[PDB]
Amino acid sequence: NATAFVPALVASGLPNEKFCFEGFLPQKKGRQTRLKALAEEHRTMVFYESPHRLLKTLTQFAEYFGTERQATVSREISKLHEETVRGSLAELIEHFTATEPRGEIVIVLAGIDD
């Protein structure tokens, strides 16, 4: 629905010859299952997340994928206004602990490195 992802995929600087599109992770049932499977993934990954849930998700991603994993966050703040935030998950969590995420979010996550 937030077909903002292709622009975010290209903009991330991350490998895009292949990728996995995840969408929203489920809230409860089957979440950890997805996370465990996604921990092994070598391909770039693409998620949607709600803004209120964003920081919990980036924190959990550091748990499962590692604090140095590279990612980007794209936020449609309005029709007139959008932003990209880049770096490791640790830098991303610092970033969004500061300011309240409002808007529609796409996360582009580097795959396993090796």
- The set of residues, in sequence order, having a beta carbon less than 8 Å from that of 2 and lying 6+ positions away, is 48, 76, 104, 105, 106
Helix residue spans in 1-114 (DSSP H):
5-11, 31-38, 54-65, 89-98
Q: How far apart are CA 52 and CA 50, in angstroms?
A: 6
Domain topology for 1-114? 3.30.950
- The set of residues, in sequence order, having a beta carbon less than 8 Å from that of 56 and lying 6+ positions away, is none
Give the residue extent of every domain in the chain: 1-114
Whole-Å CA distances, 88 to 80, 81, 94 = 27, 24, 10
**Resolution of the structure, angstroms:** 2.4
Coil/strand/helix, residue 10:
helix
C-alpha count within 13 angstroms, C-beta hemisphere, residue 110? 18
